[PDB]
Amino acid sequence: SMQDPIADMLTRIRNGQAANKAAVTMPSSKLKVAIANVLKEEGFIEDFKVEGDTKPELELTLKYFQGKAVVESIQRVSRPGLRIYKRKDELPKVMAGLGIAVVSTSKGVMTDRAARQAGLGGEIICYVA
């Protein structure tokens, strides 16, 4: 049934962008939240907002520029059927550095560049142009 929450989140973001919706709400998860934060930092969304106690719903607010959408591409890379791990040499360059790659390291989820700087690789979560 429901097997990759992260993937689902990404799809939600994509569809919202397509449809020119302002806001995307979904179930929150720690990893998801982290991802959202990362996105915000990298300027791909306007803001995120968690809300609720028992079953909290993350609510991201999508960003547009001169009409068209900002989140141009947002692919998963690791995925439950085939996970991916990269060593700090092998971390990829999305859109030749113009986009980002969210990567989960032992020092938290971060963007690929950040990881590289740190000097450590990790499970690659998703590319986002």
Binding site: G81, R83, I84
Partner: protein, 80 residues
Amino acid sequence: KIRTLQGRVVSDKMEKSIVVAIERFVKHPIYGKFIKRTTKLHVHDENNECGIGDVVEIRECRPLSKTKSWTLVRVVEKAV
């Protein structure tokens, strides 16, 4: 500083012996998926302390029999 493996026991009908599946979680070469690949080993045990479906830690030694070159060091999680 002893190289050892922890496996589920599979069968113990033969005396002073067991056979112990050792699951190793390898990456595939081409496809990059991780598979569980299984290594059944014959393991020498005196006293016949092991049961079936039991978690057991072993070590590699001098060959006891034709098939048998491993000897168990400790048992864990024996009976359901």
